[PDB]
Design a protein around this ligand. Structure first.
Ligand SMILES: CNCc1ccncc1
Length: 291
């Protein structure tokens, strides 16, 4: 799958909030464009003159993420974050010239991402009490990945002594996106575990943090909550469920060709970090079938 690359695989079946540090610094921001950021302002002005109800919003930027030595005590991950915006995303990652900006960043900074907004997304492998994962169908009328299959998530808007509040907002945001789109009560959700970070090579290498969240409701009860909101309650056009048993071989199915890159990253990291058992019991052939 050339449209998705793994930047980080978390250890221990996934990291809880209390094991992650963030450094939010202007050293982690996008670099100004070689010929000036006026090119971003021009694209934004053209867009507002066609769609004047659009609004800008701040976003977190991923610079890098460093994992501790495996099996160590103390904090296990450092997230290096900067700030960006929807406007800067439309002028860089979304631009027809995004590949030229990546080549220029290699030349000038030894960093293909130096001139890219690279807003940080969040997504979830959301599991039911009866052992299914939750999938969403996108509208065929949206600009990005029209008509494809997705998982719950989004791109959090901002607001270790500013660090811990940022980690808290990332974990909070994946639960809020599940409650807003799937219409689940907050008290049916587990604290999330970070599985890893995936890059969308179809959007000039922007990254998403991918989480595991467990729901106490069955697949039928999740379906009821989603539908009982009515069409105005969700951006997606449908919900459906795949047994965790069958998620193992999803990349060999016709569904895989319909999955957006973001959602492919969530399922690869689920299979690697929560699936793939390590011990004698779950690794026995009757529980882990060959092939
Ligand atoms: C746009 N779809 C939301 C999303 C899903 C998975 N990862 C990141 C974002």
């Amino acid at each position: 799958d050339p449209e998705v690359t793994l930047l980080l695989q978390c250890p221990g079946g996934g990291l809880p909030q209390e094991q992650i540090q963030a450094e939010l610094s202007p050293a982690h921001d996008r670099r100004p464009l070689p010929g000036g950021d006026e090119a971003i302002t021009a694209i934004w002005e053209t867009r507002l003159k066609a769609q004047p109800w659009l609004f800008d919003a701040p976003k977190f930027r991923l610079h890098s993420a460093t994992l501790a030595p495996i099996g160590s005590r103390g904090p296990q991950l450092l997230l290096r974050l900067g700030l960006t915006s929807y406007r800067d995303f439309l002028g860089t990652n979304w631009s027809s010239s995004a590949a030229w900006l990546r080549q220029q960043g290699a030349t000038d900074w030894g960093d293909t991402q130096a001139y890219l907004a690279d807003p940080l997304g969040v997504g979830a492998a959301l599991a039911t009490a009866d052992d299914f994962l939750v999938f969403l169908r996108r509208s065929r009328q949206v600009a990005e990945a029209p008509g494809l299959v997705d998982v719950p998530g989004g791109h959090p808007e901002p607001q270790d002594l500013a660090g811990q509040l940022v980690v808290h907002e990332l974990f909070s945001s994946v639960l809020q996106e599940i409650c807003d789109e799937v219409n689940l009560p907050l008290l049916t959700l587990s604290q999330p575990l970070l599985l890893g970070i995936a890059r969308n090579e179809t959007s000039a290498g922007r990254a998403s943090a991918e989480f595991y969240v467990q729901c106490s409701l069955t697949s039928e009860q999740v379906r009821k909550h989603y539908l009982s909101g009515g069409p105005e309650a969700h951006e997606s056009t449908g919900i459906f469920f795949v047994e965790t048993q069958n998620v193992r071989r999803l990349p060999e199915t016709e569904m895989w060709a319909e999955l957006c890159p973001s959602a492919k990253g969530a399922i690869i990291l689920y299979n690697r970090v929560q699936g793939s058992p390590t011990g004698a019991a779950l690794g026995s052939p009757a529980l882990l079938p060959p092939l």
